[PDB]
Nucleic acid binder design. Sequence first.
DNA 1: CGGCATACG
DNA 2: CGTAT
DNA 3: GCCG
Length: 327
Amino acid sequence: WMPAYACQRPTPLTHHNTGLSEALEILAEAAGFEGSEGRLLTFCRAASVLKALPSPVTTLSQLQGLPHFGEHSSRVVQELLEHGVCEEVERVRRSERYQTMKLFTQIFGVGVKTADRWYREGLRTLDDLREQPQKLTQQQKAGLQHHQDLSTPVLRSDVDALQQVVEEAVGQALPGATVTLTGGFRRGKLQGHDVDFLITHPKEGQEAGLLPRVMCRLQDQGLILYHQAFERSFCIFRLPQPGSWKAVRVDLVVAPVSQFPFALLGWTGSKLFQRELRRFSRKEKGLWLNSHGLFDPEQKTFFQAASEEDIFRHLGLEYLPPEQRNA
DNA sequence: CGGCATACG
DNA sequence: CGTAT
DNA sequence: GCCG
Ligand SMILES: [Mg+2]
Ligand SMILES: [Mg+2]
Ligand code: NA
């Protein structure tokens, strides 16, 4: 009734076990702050299973037979059902370690490893970092200066305005090039913390060298608050606001049209969905999947895809639209 | 017990 | 090390 | 932390 891989089941954006999934994802996040990638994955998977259910979990027995629910995740659900709260989850929420690692990792340019080192040095607040800017990278200085704006959700109305200015710059850099909205917004999200665009051109090869030309034109228009040959660009855009503006994170990605279905699939997510899809491809089908293609290691050949539908078919999976990939 | 996705900047 | 889904 |  419940397949083991998230890519084998539709997962809508809104579901019937929000509180339970949120608690398990706290534990997944905390596992990540401690470098326990294995425990992070299990908690993430257990959370996604609940997102895929057709109704609320009301009794512990309803977890029987569900994949990725063992003693620990089941105990978390049990306590939430009996008391509306899970002691372990609440201890994590208020712990100084969790709050600081979460605060530091959400800085653009700060990963788990950097946040952990700063934590061990006694640092706890953003102003602690600001007072010692000599130890910050140029990327981290940008992320810290813009941290407040980058914490404000991006609205779908913002996305439309950004896509227009991106299309304009893309149109001058390479006539005929196209811009596709990807990421969480393509999955139907109404808010987000960044906007993701995928750029290609219908004539194979014409996209080569395109991203530097796009970036230089965006910068000349005064729209780039920060950015680093290349095919991925992690920028901070200047988004007009009523009587002012705000900083917004935008990712620009280029792919040749031959690889466009794979890049669209990869960059549409969710993150967990893509990990599960690549895991499923390798372990169940013996095929190697990434955002560039799908490789058969036996015949040493790449699978040609003209659409996401092609890719699902070549993996023996039923097609899922982006709005059902919210694992 | 091994494995846990796979890239690019 | 960071970034991305 | 859980699966095969
Ligand atoms: Mg995104
Ligand atoms: Mg992004
Ligand atoms: Na970060």
